[PDB]
């Protein structure tokens, strides 16, 4: 029983809900494709677009093996402008502790309560951020652990869904404004969510 995989499963399920909600509250896609649902006993917005949904799944299916090995330092949803310059970065800083502690109080109910606080802070974030310019798109970037083995080929999990090294153009954000969202420390996960935004 590999609890690092248990943690990776919780993260990918959460990261899907989070990416969906980010695309909603940042209006990256039209509001019509989104449906109001409840996850972690908290209101969320899931897109019903089949190919957008498959794109997020393929991305996270690829990230998951790296999460299972604790080889991921950041998962970043980056929002591009019409000219492909980054406007905002939604940085999910992730690290499992050196030894995971699995309590039988309730592993699940309390990590989900902690993740629920992340969902609520995302919802209200469009009262602090400036409205993005029209025609924005998004991208997911994965920062791998300092010493990680051949991650470029471990992340190629989905057929015909390749990965690449990002450019400096994909990440360039000189002197941004920092918007902390939520920080959790559990006996299975330390996660930081904050937003960098173009000055």
């Amino acid at each position: 029983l590999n609890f690092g995989q248990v943690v990776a499963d919780v993260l990918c399920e959460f990261l899907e809900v989070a990416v969906h909600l980010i695309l909603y509250v940042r209006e990256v896609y039209p509001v019509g494709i989104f449906q109001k649902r409840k996850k972690y006993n908290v209101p969320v917005q899931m897109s019903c677009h089949p190919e957008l949904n498959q794109y997020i799944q393929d991305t996270l299916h690829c990230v998951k093996p790296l999460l299972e090995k604790n080889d991921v330092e950041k998962v970043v949803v980056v929002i591009l402008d019409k000219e492909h310059r980054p406007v905002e970065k939604f940085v999910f800083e992730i690290t499992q502790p050196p030894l995971l502690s699995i309590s039988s109080d309730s592993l699940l109910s309390h990590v989900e309560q902690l993740l629920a606080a992340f969902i609520l802070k995302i919802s209200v974030c469009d009262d602090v951020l400036d409205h993005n310019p029209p025609g924005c798109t998004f991208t997911v970037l994965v920062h791998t652990r300092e010493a990680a083995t051949r991650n470029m080929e471990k992340i190629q999990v989905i057929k015909d869904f390749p990965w690449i090294l990002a450019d400096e153009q994909d990440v360039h954000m000189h002197d941004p404004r920092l918007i902390p969202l939520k920080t959790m420390t559990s006996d299975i996960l330390k996660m930081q969510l904050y937003v960098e935004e173009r000055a």
Partner: peptide, 25 residues
């Protein structure tokens, strides 16, 4: 310097969005 998908997310036309709103709730 991080990793990214080489494939870009789909572009969803307003027509597709209306269809998604209309037929996939």
């Amino acid at each position: 310097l991080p990793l990214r998908p080489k494939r870009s997310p789909p572009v969803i036309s307003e027509e597709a969005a209306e269809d998604v709103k209309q037929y996939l709730t």
